[model samples]
Target chain A: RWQRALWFAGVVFCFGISAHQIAMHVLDYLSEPVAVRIDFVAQNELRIPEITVCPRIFQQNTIFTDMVEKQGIDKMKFLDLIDRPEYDIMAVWNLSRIFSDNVSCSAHEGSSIISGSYVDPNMSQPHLVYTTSGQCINIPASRPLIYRGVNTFVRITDSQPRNLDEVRPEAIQIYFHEHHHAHLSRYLTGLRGYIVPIANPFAFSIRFTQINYANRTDSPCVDSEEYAACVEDFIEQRIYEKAQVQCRLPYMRPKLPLCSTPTDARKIFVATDDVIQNFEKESSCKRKCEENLYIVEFMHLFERSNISIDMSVYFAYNYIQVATEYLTYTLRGLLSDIGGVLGLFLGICILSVIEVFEVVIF
Target chain B: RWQRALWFAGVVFCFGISAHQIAMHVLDYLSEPVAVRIDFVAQNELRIPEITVCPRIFQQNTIFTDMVEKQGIDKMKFLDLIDRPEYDIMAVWNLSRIFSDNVSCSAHEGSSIISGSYVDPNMSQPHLVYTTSGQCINIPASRPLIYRGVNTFVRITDSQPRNLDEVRPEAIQIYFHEHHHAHLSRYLTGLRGYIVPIANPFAFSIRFTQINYANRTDSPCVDSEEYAACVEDFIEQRIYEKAQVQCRLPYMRPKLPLCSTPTDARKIFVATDDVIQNFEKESSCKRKCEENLYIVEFMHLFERSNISIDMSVYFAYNYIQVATEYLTYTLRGLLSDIGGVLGLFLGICILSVIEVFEVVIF
Candidate 1:
């Protein structure tokens, strides 16, 4: 009987291990998936032709724009000096008139000095998309933080049952940040994973310049010594229109008109002769500004930037489309799935439930 | 209290795997990420102009553009065939002359016969963002099969992680596929896990026609009775110039570029114009166009087709980034963490030296 009890314990341990681990993972998946805030995993991004867009080049001559490369100056320090207001003149050209810098990237994780709370580079013209790569958005790509599309209530399962509306913003925010980065969807479904991109989709119209301490960013572009990192999706996009590169906020044409808000149209650009020219630079103009940014009517050189960004955060529960929770190997389910297989090692009827008990173990 | 002993043993096993799975998964996050194959999961993509850019139109004829209902054709199937190509004259029309098709989607999975080996109908153009809805490129949007990044390195470690030369075209491909599909990257790091896209990003250029009855291929596009399902990445890039509609495809060129093989620009188009014009149509142009298809100065309706594609399959294991490994529950550390905890649960030799020898269990 003592030995029987020992063996009985062994069975219980087996079930316990399986149950907990499965639950651990399942719960992990079920737990209100912890979300990392918005972080832009920028990659080597875009750089259009300097020789080509030379006409609209703003600050054609500036230490920040051209001096770094020609003078053999430490590109880093030169950028530092350029960040100041005095260096504002370089605003007209692509991130800096000259395109000779080794562009790297910057991947910001979580809300930091750069992202989070309220973030927008509001950078325009070179046609940059703010976020290049994201972990949260594309969502549990390879492995589950834990589970699938719908009712994947990382936290709100029956265990912590809460009102749908009440507990989901946290879930939604986490869900978006988790599934929102740019990625592919093989057009396939459930389980097979795809690759994490080395490049990002949008330049947010911003060029990744090597004027700073520097890092990798999503954006790619820039030329010479070209090993062929040319335009992809639009590879067949033979519509190469030449335009004078300028930095200006996009002319945000909101159909509602209200969405466009009142304009500084006449007053905003006291700078360049062309208002729509470099919206990136001029967006720094006079308008009811909020969040270190502006959403305006700006124009880009590329036959109208085809960039449209849709970011939805908070209220993840709202995004919950079709979801089915998987209840596998729970205590009860395990009791059934493993009970018989493991029952050779059991007892029940309560204590017998604790074991085939007295008789089974006995 | 033999039951007590049984209970103790059960507790031990439960904690054993729990702690280990926990350590295992946790450590997985602490590891580096791996890159998957660089197959762009092409989806319903691109479309662009009719007249304004009339500079670039293929057929420039058609009831869809000039003939709809005239033949009393099935509008849907007619558009469908137009999409398939019995009506080649409309090759340059917007993928959907009118943005009315409730564009649904199709996501492929694992190394199916299509994407795995050689894969076109090269999709893209509208100001579209034909990809605005892909599953892989925009990862975490769908589902993940496993976990990596922050918790990457599912099982690989000590695998001489090398330089770009040894490790990259794989990276470039993966990056292009991931980034090419047009997604975002937040410059942040970990616990914040996301999905790996399930899509391959590419549109192998195929001229479409209905000679083959093999069902819609990765390579599908325009024809008879005619339909309206052409690539969107290049579809409604409506200069609309005042669009009766919106052409399609993502920006198509934040360029995670596809490579174009330069042959005697002349020697390549050697196939019948019908063969080249309807590659998707013939499913075969008896030239030596192998898996590494030809990169002709592809003449689509666009004044000059700007499409280029580069695919890197096989050595998928190389593009790994931030990853984590389970390594059997962090092996040494977990054993130690749980050892210290579980030991007390046992008649620990060390602790038993204290407890068993003490008054408790004895």
Candidate 2:
């Protein structure tokens, strides 16, 4: 009986095993991935063009209208119309006319600072109030200082302006200085924070200049030519050193400058005049006052100049999205393909366990 | 690295083993059998009483009608008055007679055999001619004799008549010969088959007297004081013997017999008479004729009986559906209950294999 039972069991087991093996082989064949081809049309051509000037022109006009409204001048209380809100209106008007011609002539006639201001011979103390507060206070002053000075008796500091109109005109000078002077000093400091220092030397120069400019007067002790030449040479040296660093470390220079390099040379300027022109064209304003007040209608115009400037930085980030779309697609495709393979392997393992039992029983 | 991998494998293996054991115990606890009790009321008391009468009555009338029809006297020709089609008339008549004693006896009495000539004291010879072919043959002048030259014959045979009507008047003489001939030398031969020469002298004499009465013969064979005394003694002996056989081997008896250890002697006669009456009342004349023609019907029925009967037998033998249902359910329950243990063991095996790989990699 036992022998018969064993023989019967052997036959059953063999049949089961053979059937299981065949079934598993069939499943394995079915589990293999079928090749599928997907065709997609190029709905939009992916273009990465060199920066066009049209967008920049449009952006500048937007900034100008924004700046004027942010300064809080009423339609009848514009620069040519009144000099001060509390003074005799006709007399203040005459005073403003004389100041306006002199400042405009100094800014636009020639770039010579000697004729413009005796404080510096090779460069002009550009007659533009750094902030609306500076403009308000200096409008009634005897000297009519066009910029706010950074005090060196205290540690030189840069505070962000409240709005576009409050933004210091000195920011342009500070930008040039930090990009040149402070960046060059990092080599002298053994390049410890080399990249950060070298990238922002022009900012440091602005700090030095603000202190020196505030102390300047029309006196023999001023030494205007020497001071102006000193500042210019300092800036020139930093620029040359930056060029040398880039040349020496060839790999540091970007193949695609807009994407790889971090230089302020490529930055766009959004001026108050440009903003006003853009707003008039976009809104079709009938009068200058309407254009001037448009920016203030939106709280974003005057709530904080720092935030407006940050918005400009956000606008620059839009270029990154376009540049990275292809790379992002490629990475996503690779990860999904690997994930599919892993899933198939897991399925096979699970099926093999089930098949093992089937082989035993069958 | 190898040690850490092995430790991880061990932990996984232990977890799987614990889970499996818990699952098995849970399944075992859940698998308790549920018992349900049901009550069945006796809805067939009428059928139970009828069953006892059916077989015997059906058999008796079958024998009587069969004998009458074979003789071809048209004893049931009144059936033609019912306006039934010729094919159905006989069947309808047979069915009617089966349910009523009056119809049955009328059909039986109409048979030509009741008016046939008595060829001897024991045999009745038919007066009418019967044909083997299309033409009729005359009855012979000297009919075959049954009890010749003797005034008495013992009934040595106790064989059941093939049918009641087939119990020829000659058979009465054979029965007398069987019972009266107590000595072996005087025993008759060439009788219809049922003679047993056993050593029971009193039973032999009593059976002769009983057979004489049963035959309705006018003989000086009276039930005297000596015959009654002998018959009483024989009946007691027979009853005791029957009780012993029934008590020892009840399963061997024919199903129609009343319980052999009858408490009342009158019950034996009543039961026997009931069987005879039932047989005479229920059997159909046409069915009786068919029963007589069973050998011919057997040949045709065998041709009609296909593999269906064999298939039914095969199904019954294997109890295939019940066996399959039971085995499948049992296997499922068994597998489910043991699933945890099997899974844990498999998991351990897998982990051990993985650990081997881990060791090799390390």
Candidate 3:
């Protein structure tokens, strides 16, 4: 009788450990543990990201020439001249007109050749857009064209000198982004703006990789403080930028307050900066739901007479990285794990547990 | 003994049905039965679709003047003049320069007001592109700006007449598409191109819906002949269009063979058309993996001196339709279903079967 009692205790002890394991599995299921799956989907046609090109020499000297030469204004009183309604709007060069000075594409053997008559190069000109960097050129995503395995060469000639002695910067700043965020001037934190001196030609090979995050349950960058800091500081401070535009005093507009003195310009500048900063600090933090990163590799800027950009944004790999999340522990998984554990330790399964519940409920 | 035999048969019969049900569940799991979950995700920012605008009057008529007045060509010999090396290329109007005649945005109380000085209307001019319809203007996707709940008013003036006698068409054609497929001139079969007359102002409010299909497990349009026919006939037919370019003889080129007669021009045109048709028939069939449809609503073409397009492509609903597929029957689910079936029919569990197996093997 004592031996029988000890045997019963031994069985109970094994059953208890198995019950704990099964309970652990049920808890895990309730917690909804997630697993990640990564896939690289091959694409026949890939999207061309938007390209913003900002020339170092932002302003048009023609405006200056018109003020000094045409209007007979003193060169030293340039700021004063802008106060006038006619000169208030800074005359920025229309980059669209000059960007496609000479666009040509050559084809190798067995590849289709592009004839100039078919595609008028002028039609492919970039848009002249306004940014913090001043008037810049923006090339929106192009149509889904085939990978011709050839480079597109563009020659950008100096916009016919505003005057004979005009000087222009040799460097240009470029920003690459998704077409939706085409106009955002800021770059990813710690990343420098893509700068290429006009003296050399460069090829831009770009790729995209995506990472998806759960909204409430799995907060992105929860473990990393650096990521949190980055989100706090940069996290696309577009609101502040838009506000800055509002606080900006109309440089030279009709039916608006006049800027009579240099102090007026200084005060406007300080106040606008302060207004932008105030907006930035007040903004709350939020994590990005999807991070589609741009992988840009530059193959050295190597050029000739008029600055040339030998751009070939090809889908060399042809596959896009996609990350997806799924639940690792489900209710069904809990039932199966419990059955296996109980079967191994106590020689019982899910059916036995359900029968017990059935008897209790009835 | 006979009573015991009848009881055994009853138990065996129940076990057979239960075993069959368990097997069916296992088979379903192995087959990977899929269940779909539809979700409508609200977006703070939505991608603005690409818009292609084609004016009815394609030619600039400037070339005609240059040929007639400057060169003293006869009016009856208009077609003959085009054969000349200088006039070989047709002069298409620079739609980009004339498209944005006047862009004005008004302020609505409590909402963000778009000031004219901050955003230069001319800077937002469309890109001029070439198509079968001749020179057209294309507006690429815009930056991720907030929805201001207001219409963007654009006045399109006629490009100044090439000469006093020239007349222009009053109608315009507009095509909406994803940015990647922006240059595809052909529309989905059966859908007429969006056309508007210059006499009225129209509003464009657009929405998007998506349907995703499994590539291997499911074939799109397997049961529908109409979808199959549409894909067969239109399925982009881009190859034929591209090939049509190759077949087109260079008109009025000095280096190329000269088209000395009207017959030569007619022969060239007929041959090119035949070439395009040949390519279309030879192209094979394929299914689209994703169907992202555009739902465009027009609020009437309700204008002054010039035609106006009062456009507000706002995210009115703000949520996008997303449908995802997942496995309905998994291995874990099969095990649970089997366990429940056995417990109901035979009053036994997995542990009981394991004990029998243990006795048989050991």
Candidate 4:
């Protein structure tokens, strides 16, 4: 009886192998292009502080000059040399400046409007909040970074340029630094393709991972940050909304347009954000074993550039082109890989890999 | 002569293989197991410059703001109306400013802070000194970049909280935006295999394709410009170093401790940065033509929070395992695959049947 059952098992396994070969051949007839899924991220989910600045020509640091002089105010020569900034300083300084020189960025800092000595902007305000649980801005995005350029002679007027969006070093000390712009860079680049190429989202799977969330400073208004619990609730509520729209629709992956911008992002943010927001208690992943949909969050830093002006930031469409697997495995590849395993087993094995003795063995 | 040659081609091709069968059979006798080689990148390759910030709370921007003024201040709150904080206001009254009990946060003058002023917390600096060409960040260590919440109303008492590590919001009207930190949530979870199962590295292979790079302020010592040619040269030098350790030593992949710390990264950074740096012109990638090393320069944003403070950042390691051809292909496997192909061909392909028919017909 066992031998009879083993005969059927062998026939079935061999047929499974043959069927795989036929399927591979059929798909190959079409040149084997894989299926791809693109994950989308909305702008609100990735809000970098909009930087705005009054383009001013920065002058030399008199203090540094005085320090190098040890104590002299080269005032007389300073005036003589004060010709005005030209192509070199402005051009290089501008190059060094990392935010938009344009007038497009703005944010509502929620400080007390009523007259008082201090109007604290750091009190977890509506404007600073973006997710369910406050706390955004990736640590990697803002490490104590310093720069010593080749041109020591290079220095700007603004040393500590503030404003989440607008920052250009004041003193010379020539600099060229690219500010972190989005959490997507990390999310976008993750996920390596197996049957397909790895790297681009175009590959088969590569689900989203690393799920962090931010809160809504706007909802309860900066007024309730003190309640802390209230703000936390806001985060929960938003995540709930996201879950209903997103996590529930795990199978409904989206296909899209070629561009992304803040103006058109509000709606998408609501949809994408709410769903991805469900990662904590409710698993955003579908399968216990093989999942497809994935999501994560990261702090987005303010960014600006001049080389390609209109394309000021580096946000690309969601979904990398990953090297994906086809519906069927390759006839030759499968035959080669499985053929060996099966042959050794068929040489002995009956089912469930039961003892399935030998790799050139018994 | 051509026809005579064709006759042998037909005869040899009929067995389903001439050169391949012999080779496949010989390899069958050897059965070589695959050798996995993984590349490890330490800290230098993944450096997120620390962001420095003051705990100073920002006050309301009332001078030019249009608002829901709930209360009206008579004299000082009137001074709160003090517009341009330039030589007039700051020179006259800067030493005596704080914030309202509620809206807490403020900023100094908008003009760039020059010499003897506030030194910037986010400029690219030295640790930028990576390989001849650089990039490498330790993985498995920095997967979760986050903050924990224990204190709720812990409003800011100080604005400029010093420390490359700690950060908090001083003004609700948040202003600076430098965000580049850990490899992000994915990198933290990327090495899930280790604890989860040890490796996706040897999981057949997920080659390196996308490449990114970044720079810090502490680097160039013209210290700068010439190495503008020099740093360029430095990059080349580092990459050459990495290649010697990497591309050249393709056979040796390292295994590691279950944990990663900042202490042992220098060696890896030294090697990795050099090659990733080599990518701009020189193909940092070697024989396989695909080099996985990647790097990116971004401003590091300073940050701090109360929730989930224990979990701080995200990190992960890179791995590549070559699919090795064993010394021998299974005899039965080769026979089975070839047998299937030959069975079909044998039934019909006898010495180039068309030629055979013509020859016999003649």
Candidate 5:
């Protein structure tokens, strides 16, 4: 009887094994990940067509043209006027120039190489595709095409610069408007936007500068130092006016439309007025933009001292590291919950199946 | 001293909570499922286009036509044919009618709205979009576009008659030829050539038929019934004859241009010849095709005898059930593996951290 029971158990075990394998095979067929390959074709090529000359110098006798000559004509040294956070400045400049110039400068018509990597974060494998285009200086060569594919386990990463001269409260308003325009454009083009933390260990002050299109020709011809100051002044005035309008202070009340509802009048009028009044008392708008432009003066002082700002301080690796760590932790928590349910089911199946066999053999 | 240990424990607990919350947020962002809204825009008002008549029928007394004329084009009955294994007969008739008439002549296309789900064995959920369109169909006017997005929990119980018919060996060959033509035209229109699975189950078999798009007029048409036989005959007469002539055979060796090496001659003459002969003898190609034909014929015979095939057999719910069970199992396996690793790490952290705290408190 015991031998018979043992034989029966062996047969049942084999049957179960076969059933399990078949079930697994069928499951695998159904659950396989659908891989989609997408190729991003280059719409246009990267090229530098012409350079604009600026003749004036600021308080420190530093001219924009002088700086351009000091650095290469192609190189963007605006970040040097501020502090570099942890990042590769050259790579950021190269990528930013390529992206910005492509979006700007309709005059420069040439196709050049653009490179990026698709990384599988889970597997930590990089699938790299190098893209290039033929030159078209004057005549349009068949529109520079970049083939891009979207598939499973692929993610794209790119970089941008964060200006550090907009740390003051008055400067913050200008920074917001310019930064928003630059970042929003990139965001629409499917790139993630972020601001790099400044290299200040103590003050934690932030700065703002807009990455204008290379082809924008409206700005005045001035020295790098003076140009930076002018931009700061322009932004400060814009922000202060905006705050007044938003807050509905006495100066901005005249612009309010007639027949405004009581709710709207109470919400915008009272609340904004209080904030605007407090702001004006804390810092005079004229002095903030002109006399106490401490950040701008500090940058000019650094240039005179010949202190080279390390550009590697603005790298995105640290931010990515933090984000990835957080993502992994969340995935683990979900796995734990799923595991608990599965354990119960497996236990019940094994126990019930064994009981059935016990009764049948006896 | 004792309070210090408690304080450390509290800090550790708080850190764990904060980390877990941060991780959850990241996962929420990354793993958010995509929701697709497909809008079908009709260029004109709804108008049923004229359908062409079938050039010929296999048999005047055949029950397939009788059923179609009596019931109209309904998918449910078409699915019944599949359960009875009359796939080839249904496919040939279905394709012939549609290719000529541009109408499926099946009731399911007109009335039956099917919603089915399938989870790939790996547990990835890809919602299938199925719908019908005539020469002129407008949404929100004549007919509301049927839309559904199903999950793995729903049972895909119904078998798709059109899909089964397409999978029949003979039907598959013809479908591939037609598909090749369509693909070639698209390629000429500046679209990249890539194989996409035919959404209609009836077209599944067509994927196998390879047609030379360059010489479209030279392609031979195969009768769906004798498709397998026709392909085999063509391969034997054309491919086999060419192979023998190009690489001399024992039975018919050309004298002018001899093979360079003895090993090459032996490899081509003896081994390949033996393999071809053995393949001809052993292959049940004709028999397999005939058997499939017989099975389908029997199903038709049954339909003629007034025996109704279960319509539920074609319902998509059954397939979803199969897929869901498989997905659950695979997910369980993955979760278990992840849980094991996380549990190990958590244990180590708890033990090591506690030891350090104990020493500090003491």
Candidate 6:
């Protein structure tokens, strides 16, 4: 009896530990663990990245005159001053010079001057696109071209100033994005909003990098839908508030009166502060289950006093960097772990179970 | 007895499979298996990279004159010309214009013109260094600098040509190396031998990258010794043959005779072909167990017909890219695999062994 009791105690102790460990392992597996693997994939061919270039000064100096020729103070006051609370949105867009009107640009395999040639015949010029902020020159991605181990360059042909009558600074705001998609919210993405001073024939280079998140197929809360749809759902469900800071004013007819009451203009000033605070709240929108984020590292040349006002943009490397997410633990692996855990404590496998049945039947 | 035999057969079968699996696991562990996990560690501050610049033309136009002024053909023959095999080595070195003699250069935070200032007071001009190939301007690495979103630039202050009598290509051979130590064989490193034409006031950028290998503490054939030491050992043991192509000729007094017989010159030409083939064999040297390879991606500007000859070199990013090797399958991980393997096949663990001992002893 005592011998049987000892065996029972030992078995119970082993089973108890095994059960506890198995529970722990299962819980850890269900926690949606991942391992990040970063690989700098070398490319024999590279896909041309989408590029958007915007003028730093939105107001067309010839049409929409706001500030007098002063160094700095007048520009800030003009932005805050009550001009026309209910102005025509289309008229405002017209007042802002479009990209095609600002500069004539061309792409090259390296430098057109260096190669004494231009890009492939298939490469097209940037088309005009309107964002919430202003008009921008949008260059869509082209087909993967052969890598000749030379940097790609974009040259601004008409960068020289005819006169100093233009109040706009000699700079342009440039950013990179995904192919075929040019939306307003991209202005908020990484390094998309910085200004590149194009005076004195300046230049800059962009190092392209991408980070990818794994799709959590088994996750409950994660939204597997597209990022655009997920954002739409947030607004449709009334879970997220609208961004307060609208880049353009509300639309009105051109024939409408420009002036508004003093009280209304005062309210506009207060609303600007609220918009700044609310922008942070909007960033809390849930991330999609899988994501590919295009990140850019911007490098620039110092301002030069002499030379034409040419702005040059080039690629830094032939290779692209990719950081990807990988699921380290899986259901199949977990199942194997369970068997191992049980065998560890009890010294019993599928064959051992068969032996027990055979002994009992005999 | 029949029942006993049946049980014996089942036990043998179970043991056979378990023994095989355990043996397989042990052998796999001993194979020095390594799992490569690449990680791009984001850095807050970045180390300044070491840079070396060399003039394309080795022979100074004023002294040691061999080539008569003609394009292409004359320069090639000058290299192979058997004028004086036993010329003074130091006299030849002096005849070659050093980097300081070629260009006056400076470093800046961005563009000295744009930033309106130079690099920090601590940053110094490149000092002259002698390699086996020729004279080079060596810029040693400096202290880690705070990353303010801007590229570092090196400006060539003296780029304009006074006359066209000089036979140099108006290009500089630029390469990067490790800090403090500049050696002869570095000319063979990745992307180290490319020449950047600086004639048209040209410029280029370098994207710095590094790849590191994990230290194989347990490796047998891999040498844990330093790379310099390993190369020294190869020569000391006479296990490796010396490189046949010497960049510079042997030493002799200036008072020595200039001309050698045509037969001796014929032997020299034969030696040149052997040297070219032997260079390939030299690359077969063993890699160190732990290694840090500094790689550079070169980007250049198009040749300009306009501005003064100013060759600018800037960094493409504020962060350094490091691809480090990590050993994923360790001894500790292997031990766990052994337990799991045994558990899966025989369902026997440490506790099961104890139970067996108990049953036999009783």
lDDT of each: 0.23, 0.23, 0.45, 0.25, 0.24, 0.49
Model 3: residue B341 alpha-carbon error in angstroms: 10
Best by DockQ: 6
Please provide, for model 6 over A314-359, each residue's C-alpha lDDT reduced to its tens digit, 9 standing for 90 to 100: 6547667777667788999898888777777776778989999999
5 versus 6: better TM-score goes to = 6
Candidate 3 vs candidate 5: which has greater lDDT?
3
lDDT by residue for model 6 over B72-173, one digit each (tens)?
224334333344554333344344443434445555542111112235544555666543234556666465544332345555544445554654445566
**Decreasing lDDT order of the candidates:** 6, 3, 4, 5, 1, 2
lDDT of 2 at B28: 54
By DockQ, the candidates rank as 6, 4, 3, 1, 5, 2
lDDT of 2 by residue, B1-362 (tens): 99999999988987777676867666554454322211111111100000000111212233334544554524343222224233232232233121112100000000010111112223221121111000111111132112211101111111222243333211111121111211100111112112221112111111000111111122223333334334333433344444443321111122234232323222332332233233323322111100100000000000011110110000000000000001122443454345434443543332243344555654
The clash count of every prediction, one per candidate, is 270, 45, 2, 183, 64, 5
The candidates score, on chain A by TM-score, as follows 0.19, 0.14, 0.63, 0.19, 0.18, 0.70
How much DockQ does model 3 earn? 0.02
Q: Per-residue CA lDDT of candidate 4, range A1-362, in tens?
A: 65546555546655576557556545454454332222234221222222111111122332223322432324222211113343221122222232222212112212233852122222211111111111111112122111112100100111122344422222111101112322221111111100111011110111121111112221112222233333234433454354433221111122224112222222333443343323333432121111112211111333223221111112122332222222233456645544443433233224435554543356
Instruction: Give DockQ per model, in order.
Output: 0.02, 0.00, 0.02, 0.02, 0.01, 0.11
Q: What is the interface RMSD of each candidate, in Å?
A: 21.1, 56.9, 16.2, 20.8, 30.0, 8.2
- Model 5 reproduces what portion of true contacts? 0.00
Q: Write the per-residue lDDT of candidate 4 for residues B1-362, one digit (tens) a residue.
A: 89999987887786647446646655644543332222111121232212121112112222212111322433223223233333232221222122212222111111111211122222232121111111111112112111111000011112222344422222211111112322111111112111111111111111222221112122212312232343334443564465443321110122222112212233333354344433436533222222123222111111223321111111122221112222233555566555444434453322233334444644
lDDT of 3 by residue, B7-39 (tens): 555556666867887887787766656545567
Candidate 6: the clashing residue pairs are A114-B302, A114-B303, A303-B114, A347-B347, A348-B347
lDDT of 3 by residue, A277-305 (tens): 44336545444556667777543211223
The CAPRI category of model 4 is incorrect
- The Cα error of candidate 6 at residue B256, in Å, is 22
**TM-score of every model versus the real structure:** 0.19, 0.15, 0.43, 0.25, 0.16, 0.57
